[PDB]
């Protein structure tokens, strides 16, 4: 009876942290817009996507509200913490010092940004994302911060 009402709806977790090759060396309208658009075009909407990730676009209901708010804070802070330990705490587009490994993806760069969407990219890089994060954390950010502290 409830499926007949919820048939239109799917619950998805937003993964606002993406990694992609570039040429760098270091309102809620449109909230998930450009999801079906290619990358690049979907990189110009980061401001609206980054916002509303903290607030959004009967004991039982109160506990579900508490679980929802704690979970939202937990995920928001996991993403902001990842940005912090990467040295990206408030840049929104954070260029890094990790060279791109062709073993992760070799799509001539133009295909990633002009044809490929962020969803397709996330599906293709899901097996490497943990390696990319490891290099962002263990190698370049703590080494960069130590080097900046070698006064």
């Amino acid at each position: 009876n409830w499926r007949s009402e919820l048939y239109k709806y799917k619950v998805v977790k937003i993964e606002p942290l993406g990694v992609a090759p570039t040429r760098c060396k270091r309102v809620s309208l449109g909230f998930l817009g450009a999801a079906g658009s290619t990358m690049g075009a979907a990189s110009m909407t980061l401001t609206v996507q980054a916002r509303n990730l903290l607030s959004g676009i009967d004991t039982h209901w109160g506990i579900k509200q508490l679980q929802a708010r704690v979970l939202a804070v937990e995920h928001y802070l996991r993403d902001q913490q990842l940005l912090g330990i990467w040295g990206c705490s408030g840049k929104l587009i954070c260029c890094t010092n990790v060279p791109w490994n062709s073993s992760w993806s070799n799509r001539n760069l133009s295909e990633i940004w002009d044809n490929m969407t962020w969803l397709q990219w996330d599906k293709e890089i899901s097996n490497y994302t943990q390696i990319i994060y490891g290099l962002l954390e263990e190698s370049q950010n703590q080494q960069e911060k130590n080097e900046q502290d070698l006064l």
Binding site: K13, L17, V19, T22, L32, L46, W100, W118, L135
Partner: protein, 44 residues
């Protein structure tokens, strides 16, 4: 040549289960499926 760039706010999602809460239109405090302790919905 190419370097890793971190983008926060990419329109990416994955199928996931999560605890959902309730919202209601205005407020009967004695309703079985109580709408008190629910957040009001947006006017639009």
């Amino acid at each position: 040549n190419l370097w890793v760039t971190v983008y926060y706010g990419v329109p990416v999602w994955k199928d996931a289960e999560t605890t959902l809460f309730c919202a209601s239109d205005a407020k009967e405090k004695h309703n079985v499926w109580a709408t008190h302790a629910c957040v009001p919905t947006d006017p639009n």
